[model samples]
Target: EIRRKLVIVGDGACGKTCLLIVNSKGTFPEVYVPTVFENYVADVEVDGKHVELALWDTAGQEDYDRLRPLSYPDSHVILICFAIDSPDSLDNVQEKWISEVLHFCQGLPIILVGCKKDLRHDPKTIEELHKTSQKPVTPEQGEEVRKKIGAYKYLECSARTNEGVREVFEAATRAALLTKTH
Candidate 1:
């Protein structure tokens, strides 16, 4: 048996918490509640190995800026996420998150995750964005950020629909295994 720690960060309400809950608990949280910091344990099997994957969820609010780095110290991998419906959230990925992650979790594997995939094309979501002259983030934009950040990979997931959720963790587990620990 093996264990790895994964820490996730992104803009508030960007679906970071839902990603963890869906992956570890198999349920989607119906109500939106802000998070401070939360932890979850997920059992994952990838490439024929069993792993106890520790999931660390951090608050993305500016109020927690001084405290969030605590989640980074021992992390085996990091997931910097953004909601597909929020274009500004994706912009922050480069403007804010990548620098913070590099500062604290240098040398760790990072996977850029686009959450709330189901909303990317929702009429309501599109209408709201159009009001601001923006559109849902395209897959190409997600890949562009992944490359700009030098992340290990880019993945998209819709926790509400459970689409691509397992694949995110599977890719994470494989990336974690590549690290050599002293």
Candidate 2:
């Protein structure tokens, strides 16, 4: 298998666990569970190219966030999950999550994923997400975040509804494969 590993990290309740399972060959739990220092790995394919995608679903605690740079020393891609319900959660991630991922990965593919799009239709939540942070961010703002973090791809997903799950994996794998060939 071609060696390719990915990481998904963010603060607690950011939906990293649900995001990972939805992309992998498994399904999210009907009853959600919190990932306390947990990790999951899966073997996947991209354009028929066999690759092992060792995805680390970190338990978004202070200790885990601190160890991110050390533990994820080498990663092909990094995807930060942001929850729509919690605007501050997404706002605070760049400094904490992006810094650590960038420190270890250098200029690798850093993906920005916004989960809980099912809530975007709610105006109150959107406004809260905008006001709580240092600055306001729309869906377009999230796209700009992709540029800031060196992400080749960005997606807004709903793990509960299984939105954008396939595209997230396929896009990442395709990009990973491109890295090897080119």
Candidate 3:
């Protein structure tokens, strides 16, 4: 069996681990718990490509910094999830994040995701939230994110509502395998 490894590295409590668990095993924890090590595995098919993904939910804690870079060496693809609700997380320099991770994968696909789109209907302003970020989300933040991430594509997703959630992951995986003739 051919196995493809897709590692998701992100800040803790950013829904990185939960995304993999909920989508892959169809399970979620009763309470939020930080994953200090690798988390789950997913088997999915896009078009005709069979993908076996070993989802590694990395911890962004300062103590784990050294080990973080080593986990991405063989990743077929990378998903850098940033929480839209947290100003500090989004303010993070994505260039630095991408550079460190890509040092291992080297030009492999990177899908930048802003999780918790459902929170928009809650008590906060989704649009304003992203602006505080160092990257600064725009009035057309949705489109801007899609362009900035320069992932195969960028999208907003909600774990609670599953709003456009599947489409985000689906598109990322599809981009991971698609070949451009140009």
Candidate 4:
């Protein structure tokens, strides 16, 4: 069995862990939980072959600054994530996350992911963002970052709704397989 590593990184509380769990285990989380590194072994079938996919979740907190890169060395694909409800999280794609990923996992295919996509249209979410003079990120805004970062693909998903969740892993697996050939 070939084990391909896929690592994810983004700002804390941006729903990295939940996204990982939802895709691998098919369940959404019930509450907020902070984590450093969450790894899951996903059994995925590709072209009739069973592939052992390793999903590694890294800390977005400054506390794990030095430790996070340790997960990058053997990564087949790197997911740089942001919460759609927080525009600043998208900004971090350029400000913080991009630089770190480039520094650690250069040449790895990157997929820019927008998490919490369900809140992009929620009235309560809109009201909260309006109070802060901010708004949920639009797909166009997310695409702009993806282009600037040279991400292999741009994807958005909601853990609560399970929309586009499967596509995320499918694309990651596809990218991993494609990279191995080159």
Q: Which residue pairs of candidate 4 clash?
A: none
Backbone clash tally for model 3? 1
TM-score of each: 0.97, 0.81, 0.79, 0.95
Q: Write the per-residue lDDT of candidate 3 for residues 22-137, one digit (tens) a residue.
A: 67766555687766777576777777777665677787665787787767765667877766666455545264566677567776777777776656545446456546654323
Report clash pairs, candidate 1.
Answer: none
Model 2 — which ten-residue stretch has the worst lDDT?
A: 129-138
Q: How much is 110 displaced in model 2, in angstroms?
A: 0.8
Over the full model, what C-alpha lDDT does candidate 1 score relative to the true structure? 0.92
lDDT of model 3 at residue 107? Answer: 69
Among the numbered candidates, top lDDT falls to 1
The model with the greater TM-score, 2 or 4, is 4
lDDT (10s digit) by residue, model 2, range 106-156: 767767888877777767766665675533235887887778766777788
Candidate 4 residue lDDT tens string, 17-100? 998898889888787778877789888776776668899988888798888888888789999999999998998889999999
TM-score, predicted candidate 3 vs. hidden true structure: 0.79
Candidate 1 per-residue lDDT over residues 86-159, each given as its tens digit:
99999999999999999998799999999999998799999989999999999999999999899889999999
Which of candidates 1 and 4 is the stronger one according to TM-score?
A: 1
Worst 10 residues of 4 by lDDT: 44-53
- Each model's lDDT comes to 0.92, 0.72, 0.64, 0.89
lDDT of 1 at 59: 96
